[PDB]
Every structure is written in C-alpha cells, then in structure tokens.
Amino acid sequence: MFNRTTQLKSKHPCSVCTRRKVKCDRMIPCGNCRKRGQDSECMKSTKLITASSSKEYLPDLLLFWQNYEYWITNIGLYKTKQRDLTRTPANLDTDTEECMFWMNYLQKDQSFQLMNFAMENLGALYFGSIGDISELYLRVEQYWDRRADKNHSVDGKYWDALIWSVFTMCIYYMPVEKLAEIFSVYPLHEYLGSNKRLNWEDGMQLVMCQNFARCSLFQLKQCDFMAHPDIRLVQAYLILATTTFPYDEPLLANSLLTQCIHTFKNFHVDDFRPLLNDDPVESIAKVTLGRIFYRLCGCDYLQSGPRKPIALHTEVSSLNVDVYREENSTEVLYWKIISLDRDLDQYLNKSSKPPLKTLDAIRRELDIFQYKVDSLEEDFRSNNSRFQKFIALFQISTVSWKLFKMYLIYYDTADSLLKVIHYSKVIISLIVNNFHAKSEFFNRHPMVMQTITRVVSFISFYQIFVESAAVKQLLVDLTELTANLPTIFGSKLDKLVYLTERLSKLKLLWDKVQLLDSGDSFYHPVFKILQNDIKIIELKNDEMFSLIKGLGSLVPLNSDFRTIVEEFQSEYNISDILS
Amino acid sequence: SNVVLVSGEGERFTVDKKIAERSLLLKNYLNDEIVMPVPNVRSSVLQKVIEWAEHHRDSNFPDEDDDDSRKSAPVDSWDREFLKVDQEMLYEIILAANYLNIKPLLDAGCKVVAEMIRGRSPEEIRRTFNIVNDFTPEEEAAIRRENEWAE
Amino acid sequence: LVQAYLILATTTFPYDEPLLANSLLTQCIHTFKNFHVDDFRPLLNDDPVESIAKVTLGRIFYRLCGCDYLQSGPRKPIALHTEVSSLLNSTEVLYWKIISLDRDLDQYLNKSSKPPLKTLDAIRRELDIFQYKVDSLEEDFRSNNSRFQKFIALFQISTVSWKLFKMYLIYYDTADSLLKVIHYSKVIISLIVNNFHAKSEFFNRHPMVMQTITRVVSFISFYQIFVESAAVKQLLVDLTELTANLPTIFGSKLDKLVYLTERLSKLKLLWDKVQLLDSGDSFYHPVFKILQNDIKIIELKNDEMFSLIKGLGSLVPLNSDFRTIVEEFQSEYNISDILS
Amino acid sequence: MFNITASSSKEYLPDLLLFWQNYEYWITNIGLYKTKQRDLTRTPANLDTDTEECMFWMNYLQKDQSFQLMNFAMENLGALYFGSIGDISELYL
Amino acid sequence: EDRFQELVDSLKPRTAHQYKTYYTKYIQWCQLNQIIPTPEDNSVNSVPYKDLPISAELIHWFLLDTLITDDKPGEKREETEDLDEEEENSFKIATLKKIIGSLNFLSKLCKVHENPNANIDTKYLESVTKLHTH
Amino acid sequence: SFNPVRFLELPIDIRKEVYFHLDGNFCGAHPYPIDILYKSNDVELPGRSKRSKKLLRYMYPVFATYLNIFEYSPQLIEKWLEYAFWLRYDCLVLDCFKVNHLYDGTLIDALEWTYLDNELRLAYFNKASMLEVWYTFKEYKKWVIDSVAFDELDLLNVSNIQFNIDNLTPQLVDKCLSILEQKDLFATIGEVQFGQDNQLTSISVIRTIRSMESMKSLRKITVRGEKLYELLINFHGFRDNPGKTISYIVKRRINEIRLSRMNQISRTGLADFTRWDNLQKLVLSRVAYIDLNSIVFPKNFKSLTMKRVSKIKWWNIEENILKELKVDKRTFKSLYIKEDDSKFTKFFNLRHTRIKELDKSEINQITYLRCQAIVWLSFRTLNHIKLQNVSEVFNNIIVPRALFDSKRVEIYRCEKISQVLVI
Ligand SMILES: [Zn+2]
Ligand SMILES: [Zn+2]
C-alpha cells in the first residue's frame, strides 16, 4: 500500500541509475535517488524542480484497493464461513422436528396468496428458472392433495422442494404490510421461544425465510437428490439463489451449486438452439434448458471464490470458449451484463493491469446494453416489468461504476473520479427511487447488497486519503442509504455498517499520525492495518488448518507504529465481519 | 420535455429533451424538470456544447464503431467556424464531450487538434524538440550531431 | 468425506449406486480442490506437520484420480483425472502409473480416431518398465497384505497388457498379436484361479477383476463369433468356467455378465446358420444389425433428454427375413436385461 | 459393424473390430456397470425408512465384532486403505 | 462522377501515385513540345482533363523521346558490362510496361471527364510492348 | 502556434482520440489523397531553389525507393526533407506510438519492417503509402516501448509488426530476411503480406514462405493478388505438396486472413478454407464478387467482415426457409414479413435499408425455431458480419435475432443494399 509513484514520470531511466547500473524507480526525480538525498542532481534535465505538490501514495494505494476490495468486500464479508467442526452440532433429529413445524405452519390459502404475490410481482426472478407460474399452481394443488399421504414418490418431492423454494422467494421479497395480512406471528413465537415484541420488521421475516429455505433443502434431502439428478434441483436452487441464502450458508450454497453443475452437465446439451431433427417437445425443452443455463451461469459467477473451485461459466463477451452469442437475447441479457462484470472483476486478485482496449470495448457494450434496456416493453398493468427494468438497469449502473473505478485506479483518465461519483449517485437514485410505495421490495435483491458494499467501501476508502467535497457529500448520502437499506439483509447489513465505521475511524487515525517519508516508499499505521486485514482474511480462507484437523489428532503449531496498529486491531478487529 | 444541465460553476441550462439526448450520459440518466450535475465543465464551455447540440438536432452521424466513416469524415463548415476558439477552451470542449459522452462532438472537435498537429511547419517541429525530455542529453547531442551537416 | 468415499469405492458401491457414487465423487472433487493444494512435494520452509499433510493429500489425490477414471462415463461429467499429465509410499504411485497407462489406452474406445503405432509402442515400452517394477516387488507369504498388494499390481499390469495387445490386434492386425491376447488372458486366468488354491479367495472380490473379466470374456466371445480358432475356443471355455467361478459378492453383475456371455454365444449360432450377404460395398447380416441395436438401445437409455422433459413438467414425451430374425432374437435375448 | 447377392470375403473384419472398440465401451463399460435406469414417479422417497434402517444396522453391529473387523482390515486389506487413510492403527482410537 | 469510386479503388495508392508520376512526365513532355498549350507564365501550370491529347502515336512518341532514346551524351559510356546494361534495359522494359499502363489509366481517367481526344488504340501499344519484349 | 506540452498534460483518452483521427499523418508534407486529384478539372504540374539542391543530393538517395513515387510536384519532396530530420524524434509522434502500443496496435495501423540506410529499421506508412517515421529496433524498444512498459512484463513484448512484401525488391526481401534471421526478431513480427504485382510463384514469395516456420508469433496473414490467392492460401484441391506450399505447421498459428483486392475468390467451383483450421476473422477487403455458398468455413470461425465489395450473392437462406414453412416467395414477402422497428432497430439508424422481421401471429412458436435453425444451419457458428461499402445483393439478406441484437451484425455504408430481414 506504499511506494513513491509520483506524477510526471520520466521517459528514460535517469543518469544516476545508469552511472550505478541498478534498477530505476522511473519517477521525477526518483525513489532511488531521493532515498540518498540526490534530489537536485537528478532534476537537471529541463524545466527542473517541477512541483510535485500532490499525494504520491495514491496510485499504488488504489492498486492496493483492487486487492482489498476482493479480499474484504467480496470474500471475507460474504463468502467466508468460519466453522470449527468440534463445536458444530450434527444430527438429523433436529430438522425433522424443526422443518415439520415450518411445513405444518404454512396453510393452504396462505401459500396460494404467496403464489399470487409471485405471479404479480416477482416475474423477473422465477421465469428464468421455472418459466410461467400458472403451470406451477397445479403443483401447489398436487402438494396439498398429497400432503396427508405416506408414500411419496421422488418426482412428487422434487415439485414439493421447488414450490417451497418459490415460497422462500415469496417470503423474502414480500413487504411487511402484505406479510402481516397473511401470517400470524404468535404460534411462531410460541414455537421458537423468544420475545413477544418481535414483529416482522424487527427481524422475524428473515428467520421465516431462512427456515423455509431450510425446508426446501430438507425436502431435497428427502428426494435423495444425489442419487437422482434432475433439473428440478437446479430450478429450486436458482429460486433459492434470489435470496440471501448464498450468504447465510456460503459453503452449503457452493456444494449445492456444484451439484447443479453436475446435474446440468449430466444432460450433455451444450447447444441450446433447437435443431431441425428434433421433437417439438424437445425443442421447447432445450429452450427452457438454455434459459436455466444462463441463469445458472449468473448464479455460478456470483458465488465465485476460493471456496468454490468447480466453475461453469466458460464463455467470454468481448474480443477455448464454447457457448456464447448463439442464444437469443431474452435472459442472456442478465448474463451478458454479468459476463461484462466478470471481465472487470477478474483483475481484482490478479496482479496485472487490464488493457485499455478491453476497457473501451466494455464501455461500448455498456452503451449497447443501455439502449437494449431502453428498448424493453413497458407493461403498465404488470409490476414485474418494472422489477425486470430495475434489475437490468441496476446491473448496468453497477458495471458502469466498476468500469470507471478501474479507469480511476489503473490509468487515471478524464474525470474518472467524477464518473465514479456520477454512477454512485445513479446507484443511489435507483435505490432511493424505490423508497416509494408498491416497489419498496425492489431493494431486497442481493445485487444491491453487493453493489452498495462495493460502492460505500470504495468511497469510505477514498475519503481517508483524499479530502474532497463531492466525495464527502456522496459518503454522507451513502451512509444515509446504508442506514435506510432493508432489514432483511440483517447481519450482512450490520457488518457493512461496521466496515464503514472502521474505515471512518481509520480516517480519523490517518489525520493523527504523521506520514513517515522514506524516499521510495511511505509508512503509516493505516497502511499496515490495511495490509494486515488481507493477511487475516486470507488466513481465515486457508483450509490447511481444517485439513490438519481432519487428517487425525494432528495439531497445528502455528517500533512506534506497532503499538498504534495493535491497539486499532484490538479496538476495531477485522474478524468481526465473519461471524 | 426539458432537462437542466447544471454546470461546474452552478448555472442552470434548460435544454430541450430530444436535443439533449445527443449526450449518451444524459440519455442514460433519464431512466430515473430533471436536473443533473456536470461538475468539471464551465458555463461557457457547456454553453458551446449545448449550441453544438442545438445545430445538430437533425444531423446524422456515424455509428460510433466505423472504420473509415468515422476517421475519414470531414468536419462541417459550422463545426470548423464553430471551433475557431482558444486552444485551452477547445481542449475543454473536448473534455466536456468526453464527460457527457457526446461522441460526434468528441469527433468533430478532435479532428481539429489532429489538423493542428499535422500541417505545422518543420521549423517549429525542429524548435520543439525536447520541450518534454524524452531523450538523454547524450542522445540529444548525438541527434543534433547526426543532422548538423544540413545546417 | 473424500477418505470415506475412497474406502467405499474399493467395493461394488460405485456399481450398485452409480448415480449416487458419481455425485459423491463430484463432492469429493469439490472438497479436494477446496484446499487448493497443487504440488504435493514437501517444501523446506513448511511446518513438518503440513508437509506430511501434503504428502497425505498426494496419496489421496492419486487414489481419487484412480476412482475418477474408474467412474468415467456420460453420467459423470465433472472430471479430475484429466488434470493429471500422462506419461507419454512408492507402491501407491505405481498403481496410479498403471491406471494412467490404462487411461491412455481406453480413451480410444469412444472416439473414432485410431491410435498411432508410435503411441502403442511407447505404451509397450512403458508397459515393460512397469512390468519389471511389479515383478521387482518383494512379497511375504506370511504377510497377506503384501500378497494382496502384489496381486493388485500384477493383475492391473496384466489388464493393461491385455488391452494393449487387443488394440494391436484390432487397430492394425499385427502378426503375433492374437497369441499375445491369448497369453495375457491365460495370465489373468492363472492369477484368478491361483486364489482358489491358496485360501485367499477374497482377492477375487476386488472390483478390477469384474471389469477385466467382463472385457476379456466379452472380447473372446465376440472373436469366437467371427474368427474360428481352437485356442480361442479353449480360452472361451476357461473364461466361461472362471466367470461361473467368480465370487457371489458381485451379485447381479455376475449374473448379467453370464447373460451377456450367453447372448454372445447364442449369437454365434445365428452367425453360423445365416449366410452373409453383400451389396457390393457393405456386408448385410442380422448379427451386424443386432450388434448395432445393442449400442442404439443403451445410448437411448443413457440419454437424459426424456428425464429432462419429465422434469420440466407438463412437457410430456409421446414416443425380409432379415428384420424378422433380428426382431425374434431381440425378443428372445433383449439387451435391456443387463440393466436394473 | 459393416462397410444383392452373397459373399465370403473378410472385408467386414477390420471394420468390425473397430466396431468392437465402440461396443466394448457402450456395453461393458457403460451399460453393464454405469447405467442405472430410473423412474422418479415409481421410486419411493421418505426419511421414515432410512433412519430406522440405519438404526437397526448400527445397533446390530456390536463392540467386539467391530474390532475383529478392524483386525481383519489391518491383517489382510493393507493395499486398499493406505491410499485413503494411511495407517489403520491410528483409527483404533 | 459515377465512375470515380471504382477508378480510385482499382489501384493501390502506391500504384496510383506511380502512375501519376508517369503521366506527369507525359504532360510535362507535351507542354515542353507545345502539344498542349501552357496556361500562363510563372504561375500554377495546369491542364484540364477535358482537352488532354492522348493517342497511340502520342504515347509512343513520348515513349521514344523519353524512355528509349536513351542517348545521354555525358553518361553514355556506362554500358560496357553486359550485367549492368542487362539490368539497365530490364529497368527500361519494366518502366516501359508501367508507363504504358499509366497512360492507359490516364486515357481511362480522361473519358469520365469527357475528353473526346482520348482513345488509346491499345493494340498498337501492345505491339510496342511485344516488340521490346522480343 | 501549437503547444506540445499542454497536449501531453491532458489525459490519455483524449490523446488516443486525437491520434485516432490523426490517421497516420504526422507531417504537413503529405500528398493529396486520391479523390481530389481525380475530382478536379485541372492537373497540378511542377514549374528553382538553393537549399533543396543539398537535400536532394544527400538525403534523397537514402529515400529513393519509397519516395520516387512522388516525383510529380517536387515541392512535396523539398518540403518533405525538412521533416525527414526531425519528425521521427518528435514528442507528438513518439506519444502517438506510445498510446498506440498501449492499446495493442489499434490506433495507427501496422508498423512495417524495411531495409533503408543499411540498417533494417522499422517504418510507418500512411494510407497514401508514404513513409513518415523510421525507427531501428533498438531505438524503437528504447524510447517508446520501454517508455510505457515501466515494470509490467505483459507489455515488453512487441509482436505487432507487419512484414509486407511488394513494398520492396526481392533482393531486399532476401537481405531483410537474412538480417532478420541473424537477429532474434521473428517473434517480433505480427503479420505478413503478399504481392506479385499455371502454378508459378515469385522469388520474393518463396523467400518469405521458407522462413515462415520460424516466426512463432505469426497471425493475420494476408494476400493481395488473385493468381496468388488461388495458389498459396486457397486449398485448390491439392493436399500433399512438400515444396512451394505454405507449411501447415504455420497454418495452425494464424488468427485471421485478409483478402485485399481481387475479382472473385471462387474462380473455381469452391473457395474452400478446409485448411487454415484455426482462424477466427476473415476480412474481404476489395474483392469484386463473392458467393457465400462457395466458401467451406472451418470448424471454429467467428468473424467474416467484408468491405468495399461490388457484388454479394448471399448464403441463400431464403431458398431453404420457403421449403420449411412451405409457402410461395410472393406470399412470404407480403404475408409473413412484419417490419418492426421498435426501439433497438432505430438505435443504429440504417435510414436507407428497411430492417424486416417475421411475424408471431402466423407462426406458432414451432417452425419459428426451425426457421431459425435454417439460418444457423447456413451461418455455422459465425457471429461478426460487418457489411461496409457494398452493392447489389442478389439474394435477400437474412440475419438471426440472436446476432442482430448486441450490434454483432453491422451494415455501415447503406446506399444500394436494402431490405434485410431478421429471422
Ligand atoms: Zn533512477
Ligand atoms: Zn534519479
């Protein structure tokens, strides 16, 4: 997080470093000649002494932000689950008496009102996975007819698990006012045993959503789905991935996603264009499978990390790939806007700069998908068209923010900080616009949690080192927005507020300790704390310790700034975002 | 039917909506009068950009992906008489078209600088030799010794 | 999970529940690659617990790639053995060398591109090298572990030798290749029949002796249909008696192998009693059409499109004396009786 | 398998052994061992069966029998578990 | 103006400027021999395409007086070696073919500008090319 | 005057877009582009100096080969020779090469090996085939390549230089390939061109092919003739010839093939690309007539761009669609065609063509996927199309919906082309 890296680099290496035959930190004057106090003996080519009145640590600190974003706000906040296996309980006598309450708790008319809510509002989510939901009302009828039976077939229990995943998606995206009209809270409190004054907005809707997701997984376990691979497993997981299920159970969602890759690739259908020698039922089956494929590639990229090694997305949207530009733009528009995001977020952990031709190509596809989302139908008698508009517009605003962030970090082009501020205000103005009635639940999609995490973390990081006014007002606005996010995110929202508070206290630490110049590099406790957060969470993401604990009774045996670093890490620990 | 382009100095410029959709950044901003900040562009430069969009309301420009239709496109007579301005204010018009994502103004305003880089005298290419350094003084002496025989 | 599955994969669990075993193997690939350990050589800077742990993952990774190859098919799409480069304690790496050589051989089954003679000769030189390495393994008649170890190594190298000279016989019809096939089939017999005489009959329960005897008795039946020979006939009688004498712990798969050998024996009678015809370029015979349809039916059974249509919901699937002989044989000896 | 009147030539044999290279795969590799034809509408599904089955088969095996099994594995099956678990003396604990 | 696009695109730019060099030699020869009148004195000398005299005998007489009347009384004596003189008249026949092609292109360029005095009669120049080739 | 420093202080996107529209023209001593010299009545002719007599005696025999082309109007040359001292050292020019190489050779096109002034130095030619900038490879690596490759090792490699025979004499081809052999510069070049200004090949072509196996960085091969296209890159039926062919090991290496200026590529019955089994793009630059039914199109090819053509047939998809839904052509033109231009059709204008589309009420969502499978049976996994300047398509143009969206087909110069239907 520290080198010299000043403005107005020199073209050739300086005369002193060629006199000495060493490497040249090719600045003006140098990091290697400023280290020895040879400032005036290196400037004398032209103009001279130029004014380096900027803050020189900032380029190689933004190149550090490209790694800090990946290891904190992507992996350590959402995709890290610290588990000790000696303390975690393990029995199937728990879920057979827990999930039985949640399956007997949902009544019939309550479930049909959930399905009506999905049919009227959530059409942008299931139609990629399951298709039209009027086919699924018959499956809810068959579930309530087969409810009192004793011998259930596997084919029936797959539809049961699919509609319980749909019910989970309904409970997650339902507003509290519509939820209170359907469900009573008091038998649920009599079962769970908690405080009576704990209504749905206070955090019980998330509990009921997580337990309905656990009931969908319990009915998948009653299918014995590993012995019977079927596309309804993939559909149920694509419904469950529309919630905060992949962030509540980030290691269970990776194994289910690996089973969905194994289930999908079992069909051995790589081309989804219907051929001429096909059954007309087989053609519609391959069209539905092609929609499920790109929905699965989206949900497959959104869980990428070290705890998910088996990937599915093997196609590139710019410039050995298999499966792209053969498919019609109806729901690959959700993938083509994420495959355009994968091209940007692959350079986070990667230690190389993206070429500017790639960034210009991505900017051109941004303009094309802007016109393509402006070229959509506006069904004013349908509420799911506005939610599809919000999804496909919030994704292109997110990829626009990330594109101009990487322009700001890697190359520092024309007004790219102002473009970061502009698209951050566009993200705010898309989320604040949903604070009106009839669309308050649009802000519950997990992409707004991911995007607000990235944006408020970068603005809180940039406010530490660059004192500005537009950035400060933007940070006030995102702090208000993070305070006004929906409470169904819960623990991840509290951890995001904690991370923003930690970066603000780190800003207060930055304006206290004087920066230690060292010629070619700088030194500050803020830099060391930021270096150490990545090392801590990379240590938490190292499965060698769980490996040593698994292989038997093997036990793993392993200045002035140090006091400030240790007191800040003991006061504001980075391990408080893992739980 | 009207939007407001707030400049960096704080002036409000009420522009017609169809005319101001020449800017790709504003036409995408309208998916949310409707005001929007343009933080780096002065009032005079933004006024020039708005007058340029007022003339080219009905004009037809290349498809922003063309090989020769974009490079070999000549400037308009209004575009050449329009950009007989100060040099730094010309670059600030280019910066305004780069921020507002107006590709034809970033085309016609940027072929003028290309016509000024070429078409200049070899005497003041000889004069502006190492105004930015780009060469060691040993190499500068070797270059000036290499073509000393002419003059 | 990976260790318990590698213990279960030494039984007929991957053949009793083949779609469950492929899902467990996919979870084992997910669990193993979660550790992100590529190289298994001990580094000098590591904790000496961690180096022994990486050696443990090396010897687990080689066994996992062995089972990963042994469950390769259409119902197992996610692979691990493809990430190990081919060759073209120290007795655990020998098993993976022989299994990787078998992987180099049997990749030419499904593809149509015939192997070069350079490839088969390089596999032959490596086969002689690992044959010397297996013959150099010491063994104690008291220590039954070492006897079963040498039986596994020698049976695997005899299986790879038999498959190599079978590919010599098939792809090139090299002289003195049928004698090598008969010789290594007799070597496989003399390895299996030896276990009945030495009170070590549980050596013949390993899942490699069901696969190898399946391939051998199927090829000798297929070759006795078309190319008559006395040594091949005596070898087929020995294979039939040995298949009758395989242990009952294989269960239904042994009965299905006896059924397949009986079907290929009854198909020899149909090749005898029906004269081969020709149209000037191709040779029409009912035996050929029955052998076409035996692949067509099982490729239809391994087609997950109809299960996809049943899974999507309201989409429902709707569907001379030559042909008479073919349909009567397929109504009498159906190929769908090797299924369960 | 092959590539009107009658004949007795041997053109079918090089085109038929190449057909054996496909038949060996699609019968003896896949269709005999790796193909399990299933019907999901006919297959039962509950956790009211495999719980009591596992309870019986774990309560059936006793303590003295299990160490005799482990001694059999230590004495006779050393070529199998060593790639998976290494030493089985560690597993007595 | 309809034929201008496939007249520019029919040549490489290098070939187009080589041909323009060769017919500029031709038009300079026509002005220094008073075939076409000069427009003025000490100004931009320029001839229209509409009245540029092009014929078989004019092209061949240009070819004579410039290319194959290689007298050069100050530098005639550099044709003693057979290798150098072979290279020199191979250069002569290559420039002969290229100047005939350039003046064919000029005669094709004058027809779109409505020049009635531009007819090549190309079998004559092909006979000249075959003569020097022989 | 113009200020160099103020231009190099403003950021690199604006400098890119300046050096984008500055095509390759760094000098003010440029020839007139060849459209004004022909769309003019007058013919500009030459007709004394004191300093240029020193320049045309000493500087000019160094640049005799590449600049004897401009002997018409020698005012263009005596103006050129003051640029010839100082333009290659200019900060604007070197900044143009810096921002070109920083964008992987996109801005100014195709630096070129040559052999002038006894050095084997690089050269840059503009669109009028005039040199403007000549650098030796030590000087080109020193102050433009190393000046932007500060420490990142993915930008020290310079693999985008064309070789371009027909620029220069076959003796100079031999000498250039020999000096290029004695250095380690075959990985330096990026593509090769071909000339030839009855299967006979020239001497400079054989010299180029016999050292083409040693490239190991060669892509983007291109030819310019027709009687040479039919020999060295077309399949032409022959499949086993050791000598004079283009050495199949280097057929696998190339990315794309440009076909510069011809009459037909299928002069025989089939313009077959059965070999070159690893190419992605194929650009038809000024070929007069091509038939898409006469190109055999390898297993993995993606882009077929084609500019400045005079006649196109098409992939005759209309002949195969009308057999599928089983109607007449006159009933198809007036019954099934919808001509929808909702919002994304109107994005890229195409004000002269009329973009059309099949119905939804007359096709019941089966035999729409079959009507689309006809189109994908004809294209065979290509994506990029890019029709520039064209005229007179014989069959009507048929594009799929999956490829018409996201601007993956792109008709640019629309005057005589019309009525593209999208199915
Ligand atoms: Zn230095
Ligand atoms: Zn220095």
Swiss-Prot record, chain B:
Compartments, record wording: Cytoplasm; Nucleus; Chromosome, Centromere, Kinetochore
Stored Pfam families: Skp1 (PF01466), Skp1_POZ (PF03931)
Region of interest called Interaction with the F-box domain of F-box proteins, as start-end residue ranges on this chain: 94-151
GO molecular function, one term: DNA replication origin binding
Keyword Metal-binding: no
CDD domains: BTB_POZ_SKP1
Signal peptide: none
Any GO BP annotation: silent mating-type cassette heterochromatin formation
One GO cellular component, as annotated: endomembrane system
InterPro entries linked to this entry: SKP1 (IPR016897), SKP1-like (IPR001232), SKP1-like_dim_sf (IPR036296), SKP1/BTB/POZ_sf (IPR011333), Skp1_comp_dimer (IPR016072), Skp1_comp_POZ (IPR016073)
Modified residues (Phosphothreonine): 136
Pathway entry: Protein modification; protein ubiquitination
Keywords: Centromere, Chromosome, Cytoplasm, DNA-binding, Kinetochore, Nucleus, Phosphoprotein, Ubl conjugation pathway
Assembly description: Component of the E3 ubiquitin ligase complexes SCF with HRT1, some cullins like CDC53, and some F-box proteins like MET30 CDC4 and SAF1. Interacts with CDC53 and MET30 to form the E3 ubiquitin ligase complex SCF(Met30) which also contains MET4. Forms complex SCF(Cdc4) together with CDC4 and CDC53. Component of the CBF3 complex, which is formed of CBF3A/CBF2, CBF3B/CEP3, CBF3C/CTF13 and CBF3D. Component of the RAVE complex composed of RAV1, RAV2 and SKP1/CBF3D. Interacts with RCY1, ROY1, CBF3D and SGT1.
Family: Belongs to the SKP1 family.
Protein name (Swiss-Prot/TrEMBL): Suppressor of kinetochore protein 1
From Swiss-Prot, chain C:
Cell location: Nucleus; Chromosome, Centromere
UniProt keyword list: Centromere, Chromosome, DNA-binding, Metal-binding, Nucleus, Phosphoprotein, Zinc
GO cellular component, one term: kinetochore
GO annotation, biological process: kinetochore assembly; mitotic spindle assembly checkpoint signaling; septin ring assembly
Gene Ontology molecular function terms on file: centromeric DNA binding; DNA binding, bending; DNA-binding transcription factor activity, RNA polymerase II-specific; identical protein binding; zinc ion binding
Domain of life: Eukaryota
Coiled-coil regions listed: none
Record note on quaternary structure: Component of the CBF3 copmplex, which is formed of CBF3A/CBF2, CBF3B/CEP3, CBF3C/CTF13 and CBF3D.
Further remark: Present with 1900 molecules/cell in log phase SD medium.
Protein role: Acts as a component of the centromere DNA-binding protein complex CBF3, which is essential for chromosome segregation and movement of centromeres along microtubules. CBF3 is required for the recruitment of other kinetochore complexes to CEN DNA. It plays a role in the attachment of chromosomes to the spindle and binds selectively to a highly conserved DNA sequence called CDEIII, found in centromers and in several promoters.
Protein name: Centromere DNA-binding protein complex CBF3 subunit B
Provenance organism: Saccharomyces cerevisiae (strain ATCC 204508 / S288c)
Gene it is expressed from: CEP3
Residues of the full protein shown: 233 to 608 of 608
From Swiss-Prot, chain E:
Cited function: Acts as a component of the centromere DNA-binding protein complex CBF3, which is essential for chromosome segregation and movement of centromeres along microtubules. CBF3 is required for the recruitment of other kinetochore complexes to CEN DNA. It plays a role in the attachment of chromosomes to the spindle and binds selectively to a highly conserved DNA sequence called CDEIII, found in centromers and in several promoters.
Quaternary structure note: Component of the CBF3 copmplex, which is formed of CBF3A/CBF2, CBF3B/CEP3, CBF3C/CTF13 and CBF3D. CBF2 strongly interacts with BIR1. Interacts with the central kinetochore protein CTF19.
Cell location: Nucleus; Chromosome, Centromere; Cytoplasm, Cytoskeleton, Microtubule organizing center, Spindle pole body
Transmembrane portions of the chain: none
Protein name (Swiss-Prot/TrEMBL): Centromere DNA-binding protein complex CBF3 subunit A
Gene symbol of the encoding locus: CBF2
Residues of the full protein shown: 27 to 160 of 956
Note: Present with 1350 molecules/cell in log phase SD medium.
Swiss-Prot record, chain F:
Quaternary assembly: Component of the CBF3 copmplex, which is formed of CBF3A/CBF2, CBF3B/CEP3, CBF3C/CTF13 and CBF3D. CBF3C interacts with CBF3D and SGT1.
InterPro entries xref list: LRR_dom_sf (IPR032675)
Localisation: Nucleus; Chromosome, Centromere
Species per Swiss-Prot/TrEMBL record: Saccharomyces cerevisiae (strain ATCC 204508 / S288c) (Baker's yeast)
Transmembrane segments: none
Source superkingdom: Eukaryota
GO molecular function: DNA binding, bending
Keyword check for DNA-binding: yes
Gene3D superfamilies: Ribonuclease Inhibitor
GO cellular component, one term: CBF3 complex
The protein's role, per its UniProt record: Acts as a central component of the centromere DNA-binding protein complex CBF3, which is essential for chromosome segregation and movement of centromeres along microtubules. CBF3 is required for the recruitment of other kinetochore complexes to CEN DNA. It plays a role in the attachment of chromosomes to the spindle and binds selectively to a highly conserved DNA sequence called CDEIII, found in centromers and in several promoters. The association of CBF3C with CBF3D and SGT1 is required for CBF3C activation and CBF3 assembly.
Keyword check for Electron transport: no
GO BP terms in the entry: kinetochore assembly; septin ring assembly
UniProt KW keywords: Centromere, Chromosome, DNA-binding, Nucleus
This protein's name: Centromere DNA-binding protein complex CBF3 subunit C
